[PDB]
Design a protein around this ligand. Structure first.
Ligand SMILES: CC(=O)N[C@@H](CCCNC(=N)N)C(=O)O
Ligand SMILES: O=C(O)CCC(=O)C(=O)O
Ligand SMILES: [Fe+2]
Length: 316
């Protein structure tokens, strides 16, 4: 689902201006400022975000296009390392992630991942591990983010400061609401609420059980990872292969361009990124990623604040 935010440019640049300019130096204060400012998002934008937050969508994602972003010459050189300097000045797309993210829920860091940071730069790196968001020339296959984590976030948000030079990297999304009707009853029934073994991302290494479909049988949530989900039982493997095929069959593509902020419903979709060739010239593709927790399905137990970092516990 898309929303052209071009008309909101001046108002959004004003809200971004309310925020502290060095976010990481006091991230709790920065996200608190963003929450207060989010109450002033232009009405139509706020309504769209709240509706998506409460109901999701059939296609599983809300793409905000045309948000303010610096001219390319005014952005820093694309980062070459992580984590980012705590003193880094606020970038406009990061301000958008603060405002939009707080309208939805609570930004969350994961202790073992990216040094426990909350804002992650997503750029290509040479010799990237194949499961890494730093990949470029190899397809980053479909995954629900951290499907195996008890504190898996409801949303993954990706804001774009630079697209890759040739604009070939496509962010793919497949929605359970479009895939489900393609599955027969036997398959849906085998998958629903059935725990299956699942490996974890490199950062969390050193076993999990994931239900590929779960919750209300007429509108289930989805936990799928093409690389990590590892059913052993043949009936389970067969049901997961049918799910895998249906997700491919309903794949949708978003080509992120500067000023875009894509909100992925991480309990109802799986996402991926197609190949692209980095130039290592200082202008490589550069997204900003944050994870947002909401009141749904046990993400929060009380007292959480946007900016908190949580430890790893596998679903079981
Ligand atoms: C949470 C996390 O580690 N995510 C990875 C990217 C997803 C890895 N792919 C699969 N899980 N199949 C990253 O490098 O950011
Ligand atoms: O590069 C992309 O478009 C998405 C990468 C991704 O899966 C992620 O950052 O979680
Ligand atoms: Fe991802």
């Amino acid at each position: 689902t898309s929303v052209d935010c071009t008309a909101y440019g001046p108002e959004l640049r004003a809200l971004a201006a309310r925020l502290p300019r060095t976010p990481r130096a006091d991230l709790y204060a920065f996200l608190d400022a963003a929450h207060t400012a989010a109450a002033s998002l232009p009405g139509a934008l706020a309504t769209a975000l709240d509706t998506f937050n409460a109901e999701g969508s059939e296609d599983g994602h809300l793409l905000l296009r045309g948000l303010p972003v610096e001219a390319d010459a005014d952005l820093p050189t694309t980062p070459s390392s992580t984590p980012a300097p705590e003193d880094r000045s606020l970038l406009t797309m990061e301000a958008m992630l603060g405002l939009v993210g707080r309208r939805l829920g609570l930004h969350t860091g994961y202790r073992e991942l990216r040094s426990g940071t909350v804002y992650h730069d997503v750029y290509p790196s040479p010799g990237a591990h194949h499961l890494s968001s730093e990949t470029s020339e190899t397809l980053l296959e479909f995954h629900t983010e951290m499907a195996y984590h008890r504190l898996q976030p409801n949303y993954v948000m990706l804001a774009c400061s630079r697209a890759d030079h040739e604009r070939t990297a496509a962010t793919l999304v497949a929605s359970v609401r479009k895939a489900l009707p393609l599955l027969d009853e036997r398959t849906r029934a085998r998958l629903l609420d059935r725990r299956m073994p699942c490996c974890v991302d490199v950062a969390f290494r050193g076993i999990a059980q994931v239900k590929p479909l779960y919750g209300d049988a007429d509108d289930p949530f989805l936990g799928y990872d093409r690389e990590l989900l590892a059913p052993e039982d043949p009936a389970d493997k067969e049901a997961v292969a049918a799910l895998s095929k249906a997700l491919d069959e309903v794949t949708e593509a978003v080509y992120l361009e500067p000023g875009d902020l894509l909100i992925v419903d991480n309990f109802r979709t799986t996402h991926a990124r197609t190949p692209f060739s980095p130039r290592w010239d200082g202008k490589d593709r550069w997204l900003h990623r944050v994870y947002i927790r909401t009141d749904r399905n046990g993400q929060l137990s009380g007292g959480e604040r946007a900016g908190d970092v949580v430890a790893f516990t596998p679903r079981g």
